[PDB]
Amino acid sequence: HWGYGKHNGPEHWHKDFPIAKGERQSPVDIDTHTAKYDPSLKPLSVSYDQATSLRILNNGHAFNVEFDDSQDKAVLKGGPLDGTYRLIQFHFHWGSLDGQGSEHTVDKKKYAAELHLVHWNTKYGDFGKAVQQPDGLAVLGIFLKVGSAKPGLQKVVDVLDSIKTKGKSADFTNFDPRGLLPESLDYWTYPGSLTTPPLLECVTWIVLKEPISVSSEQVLKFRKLNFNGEGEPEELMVDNWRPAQPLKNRQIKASFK
Numbered sequence: 001h002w003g004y005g006k007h008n009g010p011e012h013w014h015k016d017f018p019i020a021k022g023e024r025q026s027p028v029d030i031d032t033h034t035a036k037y038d039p040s041l042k043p044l045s046v047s048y049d050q051a052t053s054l055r056i057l058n059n060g061h062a063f064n065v066e067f068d069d070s071q072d073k074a075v076l077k078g079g080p081l082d083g084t085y086r087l088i089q090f091h092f093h094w095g096s097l098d099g100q101g102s103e104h105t106v107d108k109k110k111y112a113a114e115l116h117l118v119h120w121n122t123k124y125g126d127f128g129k130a131v132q133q134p135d136g137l138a139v140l141g142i143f144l145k146v147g148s149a150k151p152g153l154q155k156v157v158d159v160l161d162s163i164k165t166k167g168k169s170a171d172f173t174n175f176d177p178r179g180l181l182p183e184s185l186d187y188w189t190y191p192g193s194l195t196t197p198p199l200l201e202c203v204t205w206i207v208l209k210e211p212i213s214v215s216s217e218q219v220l221k222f223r224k225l226n227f228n229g230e231g232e233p234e235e236l237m238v239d240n241w242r243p244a245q246p247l248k249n250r251q252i253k254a255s256f257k
């Protein structure tokens, strides 16, 4: 019964998921004064022109926008990656207040939210086999700050009322994830983990330097979602982030000077 509440939050996850105290856990703090430029990194290739979104689901921890991943339609390549990684879903983590909500931090700065675009390595055939491999997933992480509205986010905002409670889903076709990207694709990269149970150490993280801006009204609608199911006492879906974990024997590399 893991979650983000008073008695089941991140500090308790290790009792059911001992890898929570592992060597390659995520998120981490990104220290911009020790991350080193790596000239061997190749430019990032984000290929989302043929993406096919299907559905949006409130899973009781966040909401997922799900894609058709049965063909190479929306893929991530280049950067630190070898091979081709297929987009399966995106989701967000956010706060109760604008000064918290991100999972990664930058020189200890917390952003209001963080977007995760989750991709799996096609050499492993399916997502469930990929998560068992150290190079199975690639997650593109994008910070959100509160300021101007993000036009490309509004179709997500407007469907949230239909998926207020745990277990609800809605059709969500023809959504273009390119409208969630910042101008620059400059990034930091390091090896890590899923940030929710089962916390598997299968992810190459690619965290963009440039945040996107969303409006106060857009974030306020995120904060009206519920962790609970229909007909249960209301528990607002806020503060669904894991804090920074020890870097241990890892280096964060920068794509940019």
Ligand SMILES: [Zn+2]
Pocket (backbone or CB within 6 Å): 091, 092, 093, 116, 195
């Ligand atoms: Zn996430």
